[PDB]
Design a protein around this ligand. Structure first.
Ligand SMILES: [Mg+2]
Ligand SMILES: [Mg+2]
Lengths: 140, 252, 126, 119
RNA sequence: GGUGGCAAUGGCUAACCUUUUAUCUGGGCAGCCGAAGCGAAAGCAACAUGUGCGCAGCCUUUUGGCGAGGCACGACGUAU
RNA sequence: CUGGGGGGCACCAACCUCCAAAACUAAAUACUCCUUGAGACCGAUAGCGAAAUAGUAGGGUGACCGAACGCUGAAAAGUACCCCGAGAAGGGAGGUGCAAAGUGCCUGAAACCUGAUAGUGAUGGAACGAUACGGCAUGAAAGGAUCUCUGGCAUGAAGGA
RNA sequence: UUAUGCUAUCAGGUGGAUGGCUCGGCUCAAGAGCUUAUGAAGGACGUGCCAAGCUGCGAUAAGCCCGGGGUAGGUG
């Protein structure tokens, strides 16, 4: 706190000089007082007691990266500019495994012709891709 | 943009186009931040000894003895170990593990450096900042300035370029400091005259070295202290053609 | 401009903002147009809560050949279809490239206040 | 010989105070007259008993005389003519400092003196 | 919180190297946060604006109109 | 060896991967008695307990606890000679020095003690003072000169005999 | 000449604050890093012309011999 603000105040913003003794003016040390006298604060902070669910090992689980069709469509010109994509006979041939994306979602609009190869496709993503005349290949 | 180039005789022998670093707006707060960060990073840890004032086995006498409740020596009545007792420890002293280094992002640090470099173009900032000069800012010199090897030649050039009165001002402004700093190594208070910039290491960094106030550096050694001593831009400086070449995209 | 606005002015550090605020109030008195006084009171707000406008929002709301005052920074995210004039406080480089490719202009607040004395048709965005 | 890494006053005064007694011979240095310097090539020299000095600073500016004694530990020399009187009246030598004198006549009796002055 | 740099084509580097003595200049994309959520988990995967009220500001017959941000809806992803 | 181990509960199968129960091995790293350098460090009740005749004086049967003390002057030129005194005490006079700074001697605050000056004082009631009016003392510098004192004239708000 | 006293200022005593100075302390960095039965570190006692303490030294006792550097004084 601002020490110079309190030169000549005695109590230094604490009230009586009987406050600020030690751990008993805080109710215990740490998150102490779980549900006897700090129960309401315990519930509001996000420290409620309980155990709920299980965990799978991290060896087997994976966290897929995603990209929506709108995002993939809008930045296609920049992708071919960087040499990532390819523009043979007009339709963009864009491969998602060189970027680092394992699944294509479907939020947004698609207007350009896209030939997208990847591992996974939501149903709506495939519907939107092929309603614009494009094609999707399950990359293996 | 364009600026007159003057030889060692003081005659304009060309007109060189400046790079885009010199064309930027003045920003005092960024320069402030950069200079303060570097000066904070120079510092050096200090503090008392590990167990100072506490190597003791004092015990209190308790109540009933007619005296206070402070710890005292085992074979006497002299208080010890507490901050208000003579010879006792100090409450909240400095600590050697305190880390006082500051951080500045590279983009804003480069931006402050560019802002400080562009400030030397303005005659007003240079003039009101303390210096004395009779030249057309900015001062640009032909590349043979890196060939000078005797201090007398550098003095001749400075006299012919109207920048020697600042050197004399720095020489005669050297004066003894006041306070406890004299006993610790900082005996004088110096003044800042002129900064000479060269593209590459040459004998000029050894000739214009003893002149009072003059600091000579290469283009790859510019920071914010050199250009804003005390967080005030407007430092007299000299450049060369090679130095101008080095600054096409130097800090962008 | 009581002591309140003087305090809010004293907090600022960047000189260009201070010069803008003073000149905007002067110009607002000169032309009797509340637009400049409004922009001054906006620029004098907390710096945490300025405006950051993406290209998509301008494309969504404006039409062909509008004039725009953005007391903040224009960010480049989206696609710009039609020419627009966006006089804002600052642009990012991608935003500048997109607006230039579309065929618009990127002129600062000084240029817009100098060119148009009254703001007869300016649209404030946020 | 103590390089620029000795810019602290504490170190310099330690070096001058607790010096080996063969280094305190160097502190007995005094300027040479013009002829001496242009015939030996050393801008200065050391003061030794038996040579004529010319006082340059203090109460006796311009008085000449021989050096009557030298003390290494004190760092002071004694000169002819320069004296102080007791209360009862007794002329006493007054110590000086060799950096306030000028050598006009060297005393060559060692033989090693010439080599000692230079190189 | 006050003030700043950069800005979805995002922001910052850490250890370390260049140190020419601790500064400093230039590298360093490992990694962290943001960018998609729901669910114990397997798994599945959304509006890049469809409607209304309307402050500032602008236009105007000084009464109305347009109306960023704001508020209220509608529609959709997932769990039960 | 047509062998053996492992692949986060046990066993079976496929696949992947290794060869224990013997041994050595530089560099990158840790530390500070010690040597050198540097300091937005402390500056004598501070900084190490110790600016070291300091782990000392001193205290405890013992394990062990543990202080205080820096500084004449540029140069001793460290007070000659005379009087008092029992005096190698000390005082006076007289000298040295720009200046007594006269030996633990730079500057030399307050508490406390001695004397002098101003006010008051042996009929007198107390938180030791604030405000207004008087006596006595002082009022050189740094404070005033349409300023201080005494009156006349013109305008005079609320109020108003 | 009002004594014993009270208040304020001045001169002196006592005392050792403040200021100025400081061969000391502390922290960080760079180096360097084992020694002893061929008797170590540490201790007791002795050793000086006048010498009690500390420091050095060991009945050859603030010390002896040789090589180099240094040059006119030395005796912590
Ligand atoms: Mg201490
Ligand atoms: Mg002490």
């Amino acid at each position: 706190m601002d020490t110079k603000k309190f030169r000549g105040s005695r109590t230094c913003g604490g009230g009586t000089h009987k406050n600020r003794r030690g751990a008993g003016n805080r109710g215990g040390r740490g998150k102490a007082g779980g549900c006897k006298h700090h129960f309401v604060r315990a519930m509001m902070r996000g420290y409620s007691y309980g155990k709920h669910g299980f965990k799978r090992p991290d060896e087997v689980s994976r966290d897929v990266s995603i990209v929506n069709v709108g995002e993939l469509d809008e930045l296609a010109s920049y992708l071919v500019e960087e040499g990532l994509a390819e523009v043979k006979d007009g339709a963009y041939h864009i491969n998602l495994e060189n970027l680092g994306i394992e699944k294509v979602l479907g939020s947004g609009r698609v207007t350009k012709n896209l030939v997208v190869t990847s591992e996974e496709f939501s149903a709506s993503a495939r519907e939107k891709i092929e309603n614009a005349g494009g094609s999707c290949i399950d990359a293996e | 943009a364009t600026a007159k180039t003057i030889d060692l005789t003081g005659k304009a022998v060309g007109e060189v186009e400046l790079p885009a670093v010199f064309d930027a707006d003045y920003r005092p707060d960024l320069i402030k931040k950069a200079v303060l960060a570097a000066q904070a990073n120079r510092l050096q840890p200090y503090g008392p000894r590990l167990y100072s004032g506490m190597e003791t086995s004092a015990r209190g006498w308790g109540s009933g003895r007619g005296v206070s409740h402070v710890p005292r020596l085992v074979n006497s009545s002299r208080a010890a170990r507490v901050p208000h007792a003579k010879g006792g420890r100090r409450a909240h002293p400095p600590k050697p593990e305190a880390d006082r280094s500051e951080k500045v992002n590279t983009k804003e640090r480069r931006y402050a450096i560019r802002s400080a470099i562009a400030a030397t173009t303005d005659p007003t900032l240079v003039s009101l900042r303390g210096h004395i000069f009779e030249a057309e800012l900015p001062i640009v010199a032909v590349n043979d300035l890196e060939s000078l090897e005797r201090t007398k030649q550098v003095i001749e050039f400075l006299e012919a370029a109207g920048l020697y009165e600042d050197v004399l001002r720095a020489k005669y402004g050297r004066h003894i400091r006041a306070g406890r700093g004299k006993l610790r190594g900082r005996k004088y208070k110096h003044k800042k005259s002129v900064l000479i910039v060269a593209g590459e290491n040459t004998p000029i960094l050894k000739a214009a070295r003893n002149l009072s106030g003059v600091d000579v550096v290469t283009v790859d050694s510019l920071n914010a202290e050199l250009l804003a001593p005390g967080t005030h831009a407007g430092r007299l400086t000299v450049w060369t053609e090679s130095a101008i070449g080095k600054l096409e995209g130097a800090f962008q | 401009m009581g002591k309140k606005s003087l305090v809010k002015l004293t907090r600022k550090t960047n000189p260009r903002i201070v010069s803008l605020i003073l000149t905007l109030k002067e110009r607002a008195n000169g032309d009797s147009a509340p637009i400049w006084k409004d922009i001054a009171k906006r620029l004098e707000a907390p710096s945490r809560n300025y405006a950051a406008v993406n290209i998509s929002k301008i494309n969504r709301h404006t039409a062909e050949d509008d004039v725009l005052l953005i007391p903040g920074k224009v960010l480049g995210a989206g696609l710009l279809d039609h020419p627009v004039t966006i006089a804002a406080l600052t642009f990012s480089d991608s935003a500048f490239e997109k607006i230039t490719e579309a065929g618009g202009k990127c002129l600062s607040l000084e240029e817009i206040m100098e060119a148009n004395p009254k703001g007869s048709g300016i649209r404030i965005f946020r | 010989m103590i390089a620029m890494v000795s810019k602290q006053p504490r170190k310099q005064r330690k070096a001058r105070y607790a010096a080996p007694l063969h280094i305190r011979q160097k502190f007995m240095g005094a300027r040479l007259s013009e002829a001496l310097t242009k015939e030996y090539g050393t801008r200065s020299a050391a003061v030794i008993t038996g040579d004529t000095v010319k006082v340059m600073r203090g109460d006796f500016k311009g008085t000449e005389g021989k050096v009557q004694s030298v003390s290494l530990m004190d760092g002071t020399i004694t000169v002819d003519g320069v004296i102080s009187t007791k209360v009862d009246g007794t002329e006493v030598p007054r110590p000086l400092n060799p950096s306030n004198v000028m050598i006009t006549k060297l005393e060559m009796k060692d033989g090693r003196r010439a080599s000692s002055i230079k190189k």
